[PDB]
C-alpha cells in the first residue's frame, strides 16, 4: 500500500510516534518519504548483502530476520516479512527500538541526507491531525 502524507502522519500518531523520545512527527514523515516514498512494500538490496524492508526501510542485518542475511542480530525480534504489512504497527514499533540506541534518527541514511537540517514541520502542514 502507498500512503498519503497526512494519512501516514495520522497512522504513526495512532502508534505513539508523535514526539516519541523527542522526535517530531514531521521527521518521521520526512524519513518515510525519502526512504520508501510512502510505499509499505518497498524492498531494497544493499551492496553489503543486507536488505532494507518496508515504509521505514528497516535493515535485515541488525533489526529484523529475513532468513537470508548472515550475522543478523534481529534486535527487534521480528521477521522482516512482517515489516511489509499494510498495517505499519510492526515497522513503527521496531523504529522505536532503533531510535533508542543512541544514533537517534541518523540511523536512517535517507533522513540524514534529505531531512536533517530542514523544516520537517512542513511535512505535517495541512493535515487534519
Amino acid at each position: 500500500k502507498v500512503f498519503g502524507r497526512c494519512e501516514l502522519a495520522a497512522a504513526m500518531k495512532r502508534h505513539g510516534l508523535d514526539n516519541y523520545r523527542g522526535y517530531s512527527l514531521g521527521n518521521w514523515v520526512c524519513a518515510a518519504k525519502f526512504e520508501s516514498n510512502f510505499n509499505t512494500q518497498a524492498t531494497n538490496r544493499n551492496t553489503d548483502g543486507s536488505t532494507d524492508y518496508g515504509i521505514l526501510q528497516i535493515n535485515s542485518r541488525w533489526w529484523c530476520n529475513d532468513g537470508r542475511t548472515p550475522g543478523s542480530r534481529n534486535l527487534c525480534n521480528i521477521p522482516c516479512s512482517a515489516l511489509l504489512s499494510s498495517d505499519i504497527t510492526a515497522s513503527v514499533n521496531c523504529a522505536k527500538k532503533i531510535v533508542s540506541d543512541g544514533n537517534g534518527m541518523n540511523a536512517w541514511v535517507a533522513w540524514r541526507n534529505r531531512c536533517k537540517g530542514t523544516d520537517v514541520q512542513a511535512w505535517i502542514r495541512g493535515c487534519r491531525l
Epitope: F34, E35, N44, R45, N46, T47, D48, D52, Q57, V109, A110, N113, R114
Partner: nanobody, 119 residues
C-alpha cells in the same frame, strides 16, 4: 530520479560489452550510483559503484580487473565496461542509485534492468 539502461545482448565468452545508464536527478547529497547483477537462481548482488567524490568501490571480487565503471558528466551517463565475458556473467544487470553509507551504497532507486547472456 530516473534511471534508464541500455546495451544488453548475447555474446560469446571472451568478448566485451558496454552497458550504459542514463540518469536524471542523481544530484542529491552523498549519492552513490552503480550496478547490481542477478544471475538465474542467485540473489541480486552488488558489482561496482562510484560515489559523489569520485571514489570507486567493488563488491564482486570476481569482476575486478575485468569490469570498469566510468561516468560521463557531459551526458549524465554512467557506464559499465565488461571485458573478458564468461558464461557465469550471464545475468540481468541493474543500474541503481542510493546514499553513501560508510563504504556501502544504500540503494533506493532502480533502473529497469538489461539482460546479458554469455554462451
Amino acid at each position: 530520479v530516473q534511471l534508464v539502461e541500455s546495451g544488453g545482448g548475447s555474446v560469446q565468452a571472451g568478448e566485451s560489452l558496454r552497458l550504459s545508464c542514463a540518469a536524471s536527478g542523481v544530484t542529491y547529497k552523498n549519492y552513490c550510483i552503480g550496478w547490481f547483477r542477478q544471475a538465474p537462481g542467485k540473489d541480486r548482488e552488488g558489482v561496482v559503484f562510484i560515489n559523489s567524490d569520485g571514489g570507486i568501490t567493488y563488491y564482486a571480487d570476481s569482476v575486478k580487473g575485468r569490469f570498469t565503471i566510468s561516468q560521463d558528466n557531459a551526458k549524465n551517463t554512467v557506464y559499465l565496461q565488461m571485458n573478458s565475458l564468461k558464461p557465469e556473467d550471464t545475468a540481468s544487470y541493474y543500474c541503481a542509485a542510493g546514499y553513501r553509507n560508510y563504504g556501502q551504497c544504500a540503494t533506493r532507486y532502480w533502473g529497469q534492468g538489461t539482460q546479458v547472456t554469455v554462451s
